[PDB]
Amino acid sequence: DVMDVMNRLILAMDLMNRDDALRVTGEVREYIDTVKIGYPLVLSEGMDIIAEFRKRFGCRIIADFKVADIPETNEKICRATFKAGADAIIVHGFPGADSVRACLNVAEEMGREVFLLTEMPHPGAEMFIQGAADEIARMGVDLGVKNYVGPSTRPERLSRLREIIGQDSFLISPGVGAQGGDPGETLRFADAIIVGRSIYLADNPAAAAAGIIESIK
């Protein structure tokens, strides 16, 4: 089947120093079992931070690296990322099918997962990404992709995305909170929501996460 995310809540840990990242994550460890780590933290502290999170919290790690290179390089990025212990990696679909397949090849070989990013939540996404979103999602479906990332800031787009990928596919959605996305509205189509700043920048992260979950009881 597809992965099970505790409380349908994924923590986006984009703090850039190990101490704060581990500290804040520890404060909310009781509310989640899946953490999304991106380049802000990895480039600042090193790829070893991925294995550290998995061992210290027993959590699943999704590497939000928005892989967007040529096939050969994508394969290398994925291999290095999975070797570092990542359970899944987020890949852009805009570069084309060959670039996505290169990632799928490595994930299948190593027994990991690929999440296809279909559309982004920021304003700039309307320039080029929005118009290719439906076709990117269909491309994923045609290649057997089972995991997707869609924008929480555009509910009707997320809904359309779900229609394209089917009820079987696993869908997670960022842009909740700081970017304006609503937890409840987003979960009408997504299997899990991604939350970053609203939690890690709060004066009380535990309360922030607790409140979010309370909002979606």
Place this chain on the structure above:
Amino acid sequence: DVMDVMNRLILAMDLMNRDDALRVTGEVREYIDTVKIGYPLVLSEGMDIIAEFRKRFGCRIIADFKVADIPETNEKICRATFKAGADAIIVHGFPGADSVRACLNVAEEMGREVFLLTEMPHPGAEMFIQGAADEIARMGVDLGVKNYVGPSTRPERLSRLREIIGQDSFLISPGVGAQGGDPGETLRFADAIIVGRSIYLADNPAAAAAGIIESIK
């Protein structure tokens, strides 16, 4: 003005282990003063590898990170990358103007450079990238971007790119060699060519670089 690249040749160092990368680069150090480092090497050996290259070879480093996130995350990636010593960073234009501007802001503050990736050389680029290429290039020009990356595999596209960005803009082009691009034809529009596998995978890297430069004099 714009940066000066020795012999109009930029080495794409995508080997993934420090010893091999430093060894091969050392073998061809007499032919170049600018090296492009990407995620394959950085994720495998750490961001400190950037400062190591600058100190060991006295070269300029272009971080080929194909930055493609939301504005706030792009800003963080750029800051971390420039803090690590990178002279320039390659950014995707498909995520939109705000995502590009976030990178430009950090580069201006830290006195570094942003290279806008307009179109890619691999087959998959035809799906979505090629159709947005001219507009991405125009977006860069409208925002004052002075450095661009265009495909060597499609000379007519590269030529069109040069027309859009003007003669004053700095243009470098990957896809030369392994991907089928020709050195001479590419330099008809580009200020410098990027070469990876054709050099670092050759039996004699120095001979390979020496040959490329010879056939381009």
